[PDB]
Symmetry: C3
Subunit: 446 residues, 3 copies
């Protein structure tokens, strides 16, 4: 049969999408028959482990990749030409993030998710529970991101980021708060991207003395790219257990879709127009080429981002598929795509935009025109400061609301539905990188 | 004199064994005349320091060795031949560990250490003291070892391993336990062995691009091997203070040997037959060569393992003595011996076997035939999960006993005698590596 | 104009000294008009940030420099000649530190800072506040420094040093203290200097196998030296905010200079004679060359040490200025100057000498002749154990006083004036390195 020929050449494509629907059929049979209580907590961790093992070993290789592949990328061309590459790049990440957040106002206002329904029953969901939050100030977190760039110690920025807390050591009368930083747990991806680019330029200023050093990091880049190919074969096995592990936790067979299902359909549709109708239209307007043939070549990482629910996870998996399947250049694909891992959270700019209108569609708040331009520019700024940590964008939602002085009286409605909507967020998040990667292929042709 | 000629060529052999008996004569004069109280705690740390300095600097070089020497080892030969090297290897570590644990049942049953003596006075030793223990479940620790393999972050696995604890954040009615992991202190040796082997194969799949990279790690391996030679000369000084520091702590001039000295003679004899009568018989059955001439060439690391009481400590010291003194190959000795550091704790499979019969010889427990095959297969499994941390195998003793549902009413009798029996454990532990290393020299001759 | 020609060639010299006086004029206008309370604590951290950003990114490059530049330095020459370089070196650091501490007795006794003034009103300053201190014993901290050399783990010594605390887990009757170490936060500079020197010698014992490895670390050294040049241009901006941030904290417009201003003039004059009259006289006695033409070539790092107030901070900044401006050799300047970062705290030997006479000039204490030779040799020993941490030498002041059994009834007078006197300490501290660096240039001419 001739149909057997195309299936052998599309083996990873077929196995990935058949597994993401397998766990939904697997997990609903677990959640329906018996439920979460039938397994027991001492066995539930053993069930979710073959999915949780996937997210582990696929994360350990981004450290010898991102600090390594940006060297050989940003030391080939000249630093005068890198400004002709970088300035057109950061302009593109700013427009795509801002245009996605502009859809958030334009879709939530025309649908009004704060409608007369069970969603307005937030008093049963609030309970004063999530009020006990750190909720750092908007001046401090914006100051914290500039301090997270240019890290303190180079080894310490491989596993331990920087943040800030508050204390009250102020027995003087009128007890005030005092900021203090303590370097909490978490990998600093952004702190090492800005190091490797600056370190990559310094090898270009050197003459033939750096020729030994650049071929070292070129070879050490290539050995990791061999090792990411073997994890790619394991990836259809793990995604079957990512979805079928998370679905055991909550239930939406008539409970979660009943209360705030209008909001869920509001934000999934925000991911529907953007990145499936807008980004192909932008890509065709600059290339005049078929975007879906480009999009079909990248479907294993995009389905993996739905499973792993982390943009920083699926970073090496996309770097294999873009340079192999689609016709891009070797060196420039390994530069614009890793810097795009933590700079264009436009899904978060679409998630935190709608969710900040959603609580203001209810509870009778105006937002006529002055708050609209502030809620538009804040979400496209905090998206840069967001990490690739799963469910990390919920923490940056509270700093938008205080700056636009909306009530935070129940943030717990937007919370506890982010096991589903954030998986759609990462797919839209990582898609604009490779669409921007192929957009620079036409730019070098002229 | 002709006797002066052999002593100059056997200088390290003579100085090492004269120092391990020097500290016993030194420490008993300290423990006898004056005792531990005559020195004071502010001076006792200053006394144990020249031994404690030895265990420190000899441990800092295993990180630029194990992740480095396994690269140049497992990138020379073909990956098809590595399966012909690896499968025969892991079969040998399984048999030697299981045969050692089979001696534990066969020697404790024929001697019955739970005899009518002062050893049955465990009520004075129990006191409900060591009941306050974490004692993680057998399903979780077996799950934890698979998660400790394939580490989370590559830099973070150089000093910080992974484990798990328990919390009770369960105010819902019927308060249950919940697992949580927090990455406690401790070097992950096993997490980096599995990384370097996979990374070593990927250089072999590369062509001449990896030729620069393999010669880098070949040279960086050799510079450490120079530096381990200088610490080897310091090693007879330190072992004199390892033994004469630990002996100041407890006393066995008629007190510890009186109560449970039958148990101590039971487990030291278990280390006597295995690895001095069995392993020479296995080595002669496959080589038909003199095992003791091979064994005399490795006596400085084996006496160092008695002093340091850590298998992961004496790993670089054996790698010098095997490739220099005995006639083994250069590349294959630096592969099978580091992977054997944390895979064949057969002394622990002999220690945790007898100690789990010892508490069941007392307190009237049966173990007729069904528990015997479970207590045999559990100890040979948890020996793989054991670390090279001194006195680390005591924590893995409790997970055997709950799985074989024996009482843990006094584990503190097996505790606080492990300053002596565990030093015999590490000597038997590290011996089977080099005997297995020389066993593969005959395998390449055919 | 011909005066425009010299200003273009002295751009860094002119911009650095015009900024250290700019912040004094800036900060006094802030402290005078409005004061510290006019800004608010939520804005004060935003004001001090462009200075605090300078101290951050200029510290992240000392890890890929000190462990890297000492390799290519101490592997070129022979190890027989390194003893002819090292022994003359460590003799020079011992004399310069001891001669500086000899000035501390000779200047405090001839001035008597414990005079009838407001400085003797220490009862208002003591309050029993700083009595709650750890204050580890003199035998333990001297033992701790030898354990901090030869670190435990190589990766862990890049951000996490070693220290010791005390516990009282001693329910046996007569509750005593027990030492325990826990690896507190802080970069171990000294632990990696002793590693790279020993590792550098081992490459020299290797033949042409180390030729690949030495050219690797030679190139990786040079790429950092490019990157330190770009931070040097940012350095006149940051020092303007270092001084104008610290001056907002305290006030000395008639308050701090009134109470103990005799002591401040006593210790600043101790930094005046030493290192501006003594060290030029020593340098002229061995070179017969102009020391101030050598001293004018290094004025950007010396003014930076006044701003950063850390010897370990300004280590790469001096390594650029010495090898470029002044006529020293390339390889030997990158060896003696990094080892001099944490070995010759003679300012601390001048600070901790005077401050230990200052509390004994008051409160009627003798120190006739026997305590004088002990207070001289203790301060030159603890200066080696001092770190490059700002305000780190105050902790090592208490261990001098107990060994010379002077009262520690108010150490808080020497505390809280170290925002000013310690900035003079680091300038004198880092100056003797480069004066010692140029002193070895004449030694290689013969
Ligand atoms: C328990 C609960 O939420 N019940 C809701 C009620 O609050 C709401 O008013 C009504 C629609 O009007 O639907 C039902
Ligand atoms: C220990 O056990 C023996 C019996 O074997 C008994 O006679 C004795 O009283 C017990 N206690 C002590 C302190 O010896
Ligand atoms: C300071 O000391 C002087 C004596 O020299 C005394 O007259 C004055 O009252 C003291 N001031 C305070 C505040 O104690
Ligand atoms: N909510 C967010 O967008 C941040 C977390 C999300 N998983 C991401 O990596 O994009
Ligand atoms: N008790 C044990 O056997 C644990 C391992 C042992 N400390 C070793 O290094 O060999
Ligand atoms: N007072 C001191 O000596 C502390 C250390 C000093 N700040 C230095 O960097 O050398």
């Amino acid at each position: 049969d001739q149909v057997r020929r195309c299936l052998r050449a599309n083996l990873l494509v077929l196995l990935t999408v058949v597994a993401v629907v397998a766990g939904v059929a697997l997990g609903l049979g677990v959640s329906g028959a018996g439920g979460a209580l039938a397994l027991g907590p001492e066995r539930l961790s053993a069930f979710v482990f073959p999915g949780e093992l996937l997210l582990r070993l696929l994360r350990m290789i981004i450290l010898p990749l991102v600090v390594c592949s940006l060297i050989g990328g940003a030391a080939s061309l000249d630093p005068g030409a890198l400004g002709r590459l970088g300035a057109w790049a950061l302009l593109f990440f700013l427009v795509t993030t801002l245009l996605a957040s502009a859809l958030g106002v334009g879709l939530a206002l025309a649908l009004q998710p704060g409608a007369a329904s069970a969603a307005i029953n937030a008093s049963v969901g609030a309970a004063g529970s999530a009020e006990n939050a750190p909720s750092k100030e908007v001046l401090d977190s914006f100051l914290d991101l500039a301090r997270n760039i240019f890290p303190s110690n180079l080894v310490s920025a491989a596993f331990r980021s920087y943040s800030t807390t508050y204390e009250e050591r102020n027995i003087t009368g009128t007890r005030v708060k005092v900021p203090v930083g303590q370097e909490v747990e978490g990998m600093n991806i952004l702190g090492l991207v800005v190091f490797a680019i600056v370190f990559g330029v310094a090898l270009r200023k050197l003459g033939p003395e750096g020729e030994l050093l650049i071929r070292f990091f070129n070879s050490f880049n290539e050995a990791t790219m061999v090792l990411v190919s073997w994890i790619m074969w394991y990836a259809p096995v793990g995604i079957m257990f990512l979805v079928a592990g998370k679905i055991v936790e909550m239930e939406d067979v008539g409970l979660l879709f009943a209360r705030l299902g209008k909001y869920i359909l509001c934000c999934l549709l925000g991911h529907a127009i953007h990145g499936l109708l807008v980004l192909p239209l932008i890509y065709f307007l600059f290339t005049r080429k078929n975007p879906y043939r480009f999009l079909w070549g990248i479907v294993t990482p995009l389905a993996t981002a739905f499973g792993t629910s982390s943009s920083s996870a699926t970073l090496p998996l996309m770097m294999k598929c873009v340079e192999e399947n689609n016709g891009v250049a070797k060196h420039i694909s390994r530069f614009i795509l890793p810097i795009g891992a933590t700079v264009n959270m436009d899904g978060a700019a679409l998630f935190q935009c709608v969710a900040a209108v959603f609580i203001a569609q209810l509870s009778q708040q105006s937002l006529d025109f002055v708050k609209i331009i502030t809620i538009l520019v804040t979400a496209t700024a905090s998206s840069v400061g967001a990490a690739g940590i799963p469910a990390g964008g919920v923490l940056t939602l509270a700093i938008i609301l205080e700056a636009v002085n909306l009530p935070v009286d129940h943030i717990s409605l937007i919370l506890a539905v982010d096991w589903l909507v954030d998986r759609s967020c990462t797919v839209l998040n990582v898609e604009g990188d490779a669409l921007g990667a192929g957009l620079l292929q036409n730019y070098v042709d002229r």
